């Protein structure tokens, strides 16, 4: 209870600064006019673009990752007007989890959705036009023009789409006597940037510098077309950027269309841009607008903490540190051997290394004999696409397999796409629908804690747990809360159906060894006594579309099971509670990996969450029209009807089985400024969470970690990121000692935090 | 395996007819 105290009393100065930062009116002339964004649309190339200042404010919340910086965000949300966003979908869901654990937070989306990022922008040439900054000292106008030229192929499209959409909106209400506060409510589906000027971007170090200006730019857009009351009040955006500046980095990928060499360079993140740019540190006044959270809560060690301090603050590496980290070094052939460290996540510094490691363990488990099962993943290229693109690349000679030499990464979610063991691509022309299709096999493991990568639609088919676990679900109605408060009737219908379907399970437990004849006699006798105040008999299920029905018909079934669970719980003591209770709406038989959910009826249709830790179960086919929302896309929809698409089944933390949909992703990049839908990749998009790259590890914390370090490529920032993903130093093993080997340390942002920790106007929260 | 019988095959011979092809 005393843990929150420091945050509780130190976030108040933060709150008492963001308020004046958000309630500061700009001069009339400094407000970006609508005509500005009209001219931006007219401009074709980002060269004649006029030097235009877009005013903004910042407030920086830095601090160790997992330093509980979210308490500050929590206090901000419940006190201030704010639009909470996230740099990654995982981070956005993590903030939602930690904001709805205290009060109500509206669905937290990504900043990309907030400024209008759509599908076609994903693969867009974001680094093309040049800029010779008339700078040193770099004017803010020049920096903003650089960040708009960087994102010309995104800023221009956003401006054009927003502008050419037409005017009503707030313009209408404002003239009530010529009430815009009640305008976003009455006029719905309006962009969330029209109702607040405090934009919280969490884990903002995962965003490049180009985005910062972009966000501000977009803010003004969405407040100019709609003529928001904030625009009439001459308010300016304030970007509360929350993230770890020394545990997070942003990378830019460019693909050269002749060499087929996809390159990824390092970039300046928003945090580093704001901390280390003399122009932004003055305009935004970071000295009076910086909060550093300094405590590592999860950590409960002492020497582990000192090492984190020296690595994060750039302190000199001493002999004692070398001797401490010496106790973690385990051989190269010990980490890579799958027989060792079971259940420990293994980090490598190369995607090829992860592709090697995942394959060897697959062989190990398969030979030793979970189940190493094989599941189809396909691809769909088209003849016209690879005809025209080959024409435009100045090289019309290129084989399709050579097309898939590197664009397989750039055809779907990169993370799992380049970190999966898979077969040989069977690229066969299926031009029936004018197409050429590929076919490989992404072997998984059976019954492992896998994670959903992309956005999937979960369809819960039932619960495979214990009688006690299902009694708990009904008692607290936790399941109902996961579906949201606006549509509770749908959640109550399916639970009702389950209870009327799971009555047979009690009768199987009736056949349990070690029970007296009269013990079972009293069992069935109390079953009869409860039927007297209720045997399945012939209960009439179902209800009309009425709110009262799901609070009367369900109320009976909820009380029926609750009682029934608790009834036999007392009769058989702990044995009944631990007994496995499986409830499904259909005859579900699961021999080996293959499952069979018969014919679905879409009793409860929901959306799987990426953060939710699921468990791989098996690939039932049971073609559901719920996932078959297929409408190019129809040409492959016909083939998906042809070849039965397998729907992989996952088990959530509670234990409810959920059948999910597949994933489809486009590749559109070109060089002739002709973005055309080339290839759509149909696969599963699940990750093992057992092996990954250090760079991706930055995003999410891990329980047990074994780090495989490649010598020569040793960057102390990578070592710090890898070693900081786990709370306890006890469960940490490593290839070599990053402190004892030659390491390229880049301690430039470290001294900047140190000078920030050495400034009277910077607020440090313990 | 979950099986609840409370949650069959069609006879493909003429049990009834009301119209046919009168040849005689």
């Amino acid at each position: 209870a005393f843990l929150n105290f420091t945050s509780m009393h130190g976030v108040q100065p933060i709150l008492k600064r963001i308020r004046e930062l958000s309630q500061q009116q700009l001069d009339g002339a400094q407000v970006p006019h609508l005509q500005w964004f009209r001219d931006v649309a007219a401009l074709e190339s980002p060269a004649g673009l006029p030097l235009r200042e877009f005013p903004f404010a910042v407030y920086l919340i830095t601090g160790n990752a997992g330093s509980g910086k979210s308490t500050c965000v929590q206090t901000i949300n419940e006190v201030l007007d704010c639009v909470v966003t996230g740099a990654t979908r995982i981070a956005a869901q993590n903030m939602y989890a930690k904001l709805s654990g205290a009060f109500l937070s509206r669905p937290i989306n990504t900043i990309f959705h907030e400024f209008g990022f759509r599908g076609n922008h994903v693969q867009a040439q974001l680094g093309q036009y040049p800029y010779t900054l008339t700078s040193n000292p770099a004017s803010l106008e020049d920096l903003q023009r650089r960040d708009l030229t960087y994102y010309w192929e995104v800023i221009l499209d956003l401006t054009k789409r927003a502008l050419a959409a037409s005017r009503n909106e707030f313009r209408a209400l404002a003239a009530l006597e010529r009430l815009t506060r009640l305008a976003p409510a009455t006029h719905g589906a309006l962009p969330a940037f029209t109702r607040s000027n405090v934009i919280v971007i969490d884990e903002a170090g995962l965003l490049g510098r180009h985005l910062l200006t972009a966000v501000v730019y977009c803010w003004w857009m969405i407040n100019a077309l709609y003529h928001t009351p904030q625009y009439a009040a001459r308010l300016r955006p304030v970007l509360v950027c929350v993230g770890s500046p020394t545990q997070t980095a942003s990378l830019e990928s460019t693909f050269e269309h002749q060499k087929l060499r996809c390159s990824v360079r390092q970039s300046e993140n928003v945090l580093t841009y704001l901390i280390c740019n003399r122009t932004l540190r003055e305009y935004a006044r970071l000295s009076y607008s910086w909060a550093i959270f300094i405590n590592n809560k999860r950590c409960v060690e002492h020497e582990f903490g000192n090492l984190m301090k020296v690595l994060e603050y750039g302190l000199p590496i001493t002999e004692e540190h070398m001797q401490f980290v010496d106790r973690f070094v385990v051989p190269e052939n010990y980490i890579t051997n799958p027989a060792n460290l079971p259940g420990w996540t293994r980090l490598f510094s190369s995607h090829k290394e992860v592709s090697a490691y995942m394959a060897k363990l697959h062989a190990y488990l398969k030979v030793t004999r979970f189940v190493v099962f094989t599941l189809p993943v396909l691809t769909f290229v088209s003849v016209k696409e690879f005809d025209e693109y080959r024409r435009l690349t100045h090289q019309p000679g290129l084989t399709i397999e050579k097309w898939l030499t590197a664009n397989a990464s750039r055809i779907t979610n990169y993370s799992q796409s380049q970190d999966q063991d898979a077969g040989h691509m069977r690229c066969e022309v299926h031009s029936k629908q004018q197409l050429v299709v590929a076919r490989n096999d992404v072997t998984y493991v059976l019954n492992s804690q896998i994670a959903v990568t992309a956005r999937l639609r979960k369809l819960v088919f039932g619960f495979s747990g214990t009688f006690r676990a299902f009694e708990a679900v009904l008692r607290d109605d936790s399941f109902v809360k996961t579906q949201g408060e606006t549509s509770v009737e749908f959640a109550y219908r399916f639970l009702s159906r389950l209870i009327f379907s799971g009555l047979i399970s009690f009768y199987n437990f009736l056949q349990r060894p070690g029970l007296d004849a009269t013990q079972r006699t009293l069992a069935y006798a109390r079953m009869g006594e409860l039927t007297a105040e209720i045997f399945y008999c012939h209960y009439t299920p179902g209800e009309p579309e009425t709110t009262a029905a799901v609070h009367t018909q369900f109320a009976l079934l909820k009380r029926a099971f609750l009682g029934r669970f608790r009834i036999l719980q007392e009769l058989f003591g702990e044995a009944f509670e631990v007994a496995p209770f499986s409830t499904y709406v259909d005859n579900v038989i699961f021999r080996g990996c293959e499952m069979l959910t018969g014919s679905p009826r879409g009793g409860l249709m929901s959306v799987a969450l990426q953060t939710d830790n699921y468990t791989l179960m098996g690939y039932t086919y049971a073609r559901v029209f719920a996932f078959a929302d297929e409408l190019a896309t129809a040409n492959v929809a016909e083939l998906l009807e042809e070849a039965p698409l397998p729907y992989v089944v996952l088990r959530d933390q509670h234990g409810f089985m959920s059948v999910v949909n597949t994933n489809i992703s486009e590749f559109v990049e070109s060089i002739d400024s002709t973005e055309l839908a080339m290839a759509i990749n149909a696969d599963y998009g699940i990750s093992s969470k057992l092996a990954m790259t250090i760079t991706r590890s930055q995003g999410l914390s891990l329980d047990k970690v074994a780090i495989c370090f490649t010598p020569g490529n040793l960057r102390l920032n990578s070592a710090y990121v890898a070693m900081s993903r786990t709370t306890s130093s006890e469960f940490l093993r490593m290839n070599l000692n990053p402190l004892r080997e030659r390491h390229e340390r880049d301690d430039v942002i470290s001294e900047h935090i140190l000078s920030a920790l050495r400034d009277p106007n910077v607020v440090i929260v313990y | 395996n979950f099986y609840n019988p409370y949650l069959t095959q069609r006879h493909t011979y003429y049990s009834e007819c009301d119209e046919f092809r009168f040849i005689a």
Partner: protein
């Protein structure tokens, strides 16, 4: 062979519904009782099966596992020219490693084979005519009735 959902309203007991979960062969014994009642004892559990030499299959498809073979089989039933094996999984084809001898010749030594339990024996007709036509399948012409008569002595 009967399809589970086609017989979902049948309300059968255990062993008589899980055998036909995807589709399952049923050995129906037709006959009379001594009092003249026409009975049709629907026998369950009988599966058609064949053998392939263990080393030969291990080589020609690196089937480093009995189930790795089942995957190659279902991959073939997916690539099937016309969509007769929809949904087929790695569990319709249970397999084990048996220690049998080819009847041909006396010098023959008892090798290691895989005994591959098909269900729905038309899939065995495919997996016998189209699966790796350079490996030698042994008893893939023996229908499920003969497996029923022979496997049960008497």
């Amino acid at each position: 062979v009967e399809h589970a959902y086609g017989m979902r309203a049948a309300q059968f007991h255990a062993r008589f519904m899980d055998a036909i979960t995807p589709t399952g062969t049923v050995i129906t014994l037709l006959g009379l009782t001594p009092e003249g009642h026409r009975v049709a004892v629907h026998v369950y559990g009988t599966r058609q099966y064949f053998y392939m030499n263990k080393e030969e299959v291990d080589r020609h498809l690196q089937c480093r596992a009995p189930r790795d073979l089942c995957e190659r089989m279902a991959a073939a039933l997916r690539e099937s020219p016309g969509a007769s094996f929809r949904g087929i999984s790695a569990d319709h084809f249970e397999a084990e490693v048996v220690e049998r001898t080819d009847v041909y010749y006396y010098e023959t030594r008892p090798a290691l084979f895989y005994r591959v339990y098909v269900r729905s024996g038309r899939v065995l007709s495919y997996l016998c005519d189209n699966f790796c036509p350079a490996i030698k399948k042994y008893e893939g012409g023996v229908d499920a009735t003969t497996r029923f008569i022979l496997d049960n002595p008497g």
